[PDB]
């Protein structure tokens, strides 16, 4: 059965996500304006959206049950390494198969392959990023599953620099078991079929997306003019 502690965990994660994810996208007006015309034209706007999305991910992270028992150093390690992955995951909510784009409520705030390309990132990242978004959209997760996946991604014990791995594992296991059990009791077939394993596979796809993101981040960063257009939080978190 799904236990009251597990039902509690889901409750917390749903509310945590509701408080950190605004489906109206009202704050996007604070970002430097988008420019689609112009090389690296989209960079200030998307750097700002990523920066924001980093803060919101931290807000979600803090509210994950057991995350607060970790050492600050370990909180930091886990956020640093997962941030881009959770941003990719949470972005599925605005991603639409209708036209393969992230639709954030208005054409100024709707982003596509060419827009990401105008942010300095190549198809090496973008082609497999979009694949990832289609494959995840196809899962048609319950919101409950969505929030658990993001949390399990954040609390991973194998991230490099992790001190108290045993404790990190104990937190993630609690979330993993919560997710397995939820799918069995709440997810009707055939949607539930191999759904856990398919979700876990997505965590592996994200590692590879993360690896590629890092290489391209490092390349773009070597030039200091690009780095100038990023935010301080983005420089601190991405390196």
């Amino acid at each position: 059965k799904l236990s009251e502690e597990q039902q509690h965990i889901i409750a917390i994660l749903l509310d945590a996500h509701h408080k950190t994810y605004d489906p109206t996208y009202a704050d996007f007006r604070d970002f430097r304006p988008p420019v689609r015309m112009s090389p690296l034209s989209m960079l200030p706007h998307l750097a700002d959206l990523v920066s924001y999305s980093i803060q919101k991910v931290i807000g979600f992270a803090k509210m994950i049950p057991g995350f607060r028992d970790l050492t600050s150093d370990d909180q930091i390690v886990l956020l640093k390494s997962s941030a881009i992955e959770v941003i990719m995951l949470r972005s599925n909510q605005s991603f639409t198969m209708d036209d393969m784009s992230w639709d954030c409520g208005s054409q100024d705030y709707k982003y596509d392959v060419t827009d990401v390309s105008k942010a300095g990132h190549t198809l090496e990242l973008i082609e497999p990023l979009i694949k990832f978004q289609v494959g995840l959209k196809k899962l048609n997760l319950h919101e409950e599953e969505h929030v658990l996946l993001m949390a399990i991604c954040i609390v991973s014990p194998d991230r490099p620099g992790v001190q108290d791995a045993k404790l990190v594992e104990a937190i993630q296991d609690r979330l993993s078991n919560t997710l397995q059990t939820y799918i069995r009791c709440r997810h009707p077939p055939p949607g539930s079929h191999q759904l856990y394993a398919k979700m876990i596979q997505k965590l592996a796809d994200l590692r590879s997306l993360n690896e590629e993101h890092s290489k391209q981040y490092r390349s773009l960063s070597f030039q200091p003019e690009n780095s100038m257009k990023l935010t301080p939080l983005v420089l601190e978190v991405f390196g």
Partner: peptide, 10 residues
Amino acid sequence: NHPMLMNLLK
């Protein structure tokens, strides 16, 4: 070594 991330995590 992460002043801002630390502040937002606190």
